[PDB]
Amino acid sequence: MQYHRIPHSSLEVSTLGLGTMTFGEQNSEADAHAQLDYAVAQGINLIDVAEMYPVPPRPETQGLTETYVGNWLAKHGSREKLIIASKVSGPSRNNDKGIRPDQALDRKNIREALHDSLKRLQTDYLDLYQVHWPQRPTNCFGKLGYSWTDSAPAVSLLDTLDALAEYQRAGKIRYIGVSNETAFGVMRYLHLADKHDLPRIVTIQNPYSLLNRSFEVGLAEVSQYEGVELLAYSCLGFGTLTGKYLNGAKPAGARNTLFSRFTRYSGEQTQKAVAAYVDIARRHGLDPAQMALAFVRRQPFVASTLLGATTMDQLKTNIESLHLELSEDVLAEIEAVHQVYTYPAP
Numbered sequence: 001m002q003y004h005r006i007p008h009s010s011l012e013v014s015t016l017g018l019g020t021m022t023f024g025e026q027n028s029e030a031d032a033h034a035q036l037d038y039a040v041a042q043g044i045n046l047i048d049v050a051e052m053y054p055v056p057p058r059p060e061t062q063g064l065t066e067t068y069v070g071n072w073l074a075k076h077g078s079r080e081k082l083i084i085a086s087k088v089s090g091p092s093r094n095n096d097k098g099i100r101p102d103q104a105l106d107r108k109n110i111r112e113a114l115h116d117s118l119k120r121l122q123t124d125y126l127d128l129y130q131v132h133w134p135q136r137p138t139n140c141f142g143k144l145g146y147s148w149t150d151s152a153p154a155v156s157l158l159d160t161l162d163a164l165a166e167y168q169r170a171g172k173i174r175y176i177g178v179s180n181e182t183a184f185g186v187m188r189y190l191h192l193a194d195k196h197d198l199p200r201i202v203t204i205q206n207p208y209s210l211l212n213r214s215f216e217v218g219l220a221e222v223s224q225y226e227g228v229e230l231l232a233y234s235c236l237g238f239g240t241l242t243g244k245y246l247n248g249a250k251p252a253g254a255r256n257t258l259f260s261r262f263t264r265y266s267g268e269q270t271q272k273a274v275a276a277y278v279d280i281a282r283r284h285g286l287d288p289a290q291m292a293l294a295f296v297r298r299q300p301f302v303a304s305t306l307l308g309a310t311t312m313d314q315l316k317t318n319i320e321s322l323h324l325e326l327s328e329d330v331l332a333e334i335e336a337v338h339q340v341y342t343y344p345a346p
């Protein structure tokens with residue numbers, strides 16, 4: 001395993017991290033524990049969870065992911081070597097059911113969320129606690145460009161940062177991060193930390209893959225100058241970059257076959273781009289999943305790649321991507337496809 005030191009922190013993260021959002025839905029608790037054991041045996045220390053997992057989310061299963069991870073933590077011990085990252089939900093969205101009434105990123109909601117997460121995770125602190133998505137409407141979750149809003153948000157970034165600061169002082173969270181944010185939002189949080197002597201966010205967890213490189217327009221430069229580094233998610237486009245859905249295929253047991261609500265990587269242009277990337281991989285003798293992962297790993301703004309797997313063989317293949325280094329010729333072909341299909345799946 002390779003590791004990466006996050007600026008302004010004591011976190012040295014494994015270059016690959018283990019995402020967990022299927023734990024409790026597609027994956028059982030024994031599957032979860034087998035993946036956590038395997039990941040740690042391969043040197044991964046970063047485990048990413050959320051109060052809303054697993055997905056697709058519903059009240060009946062809400063919190064099962066954290067509970068499975070906590071049950072594992074209780075048994076395997078060596079807690080201190082792990083970097084357990086969780087999240088507090090933004091305002092309810094996408095017609096999904098909330099966890100709390102009139103859910104917002106204010107002190108009351110954050111206090112409740114954090115305590116419930118710590119209880120399920122069976123630990124007294126989180127290494128990283130992340131704002132899952134912004135309070136204000138912005139360009140995340142399928143929206144490439146920003147649309148002007150009329151309504152000022154109900155809770156400001158300073159409100160949210162001040163609330164988090166209390167729990168950092170209390171030692172319940174070591175570091176704070178954001179998720180599904182933008183260049184404006186990151187810079188505002190950083191401005192506020194300096195102006196008000198408040199904690200400085202250290203990471204942003206945003207989608208990044210061959211199908212959504214939009215982080216490069218505004219956020220990559222923030223990462224270089226400010227040190228807020230990317231924890232990249234959905235680096236296989238929900239599994240589409242493996243090529244498993246090409247030519248109308250709907251493999252049994254796969255995410256998009258089971259849950260047709262997941263459309264983020266199913267648009268017309270996206271499907272054309274997937275076929276093009278898989279073609280590059282096949283011509284260069286690469287596994288499409290590994291090529292997609294190695295492309296994300298090599299970016300200088302990526303601190304860690306959050307892997308997703310529903311089987312042990314998938315997880316083994318994905319961790320083995322560490323050893324793939326992309327050639328100049330493959331990189332140039334990728335650039336050519338990206339010119340034709342630019343940010344197709346925001």
Ligand SMILES: NC(=O)C1=CN([C@@H]2O[C@H](COP(=O)(O)OP(=O)(O)OC[C@H]3O[C@@H](n4cnc5c(N)ncnc54)[C@H](OP(=O)(O)O)[C@@H]3O)[C@@H](O)[C@H]2O)C=CC1
Binds near residue numbers: 048235310
């Ligand atoms: N902050 C946020 O808003 C978000 C955070 N995340 C984080 O990122 C993690 C990863 O996200 P996710 O969307 O799962 O990541 P990917 O885009 O990498 O999709 C992973 C899925 O693809 C399939 N797959 C994985 N590897 C292979 C392989 N080698 N061959 C064939 N199929 C494969 C599996 O699904 P299947 O077997 O069903 O086909 C797996 O669940 C999450 O667990 C979560 O921690 C994710 C989304 C949003």
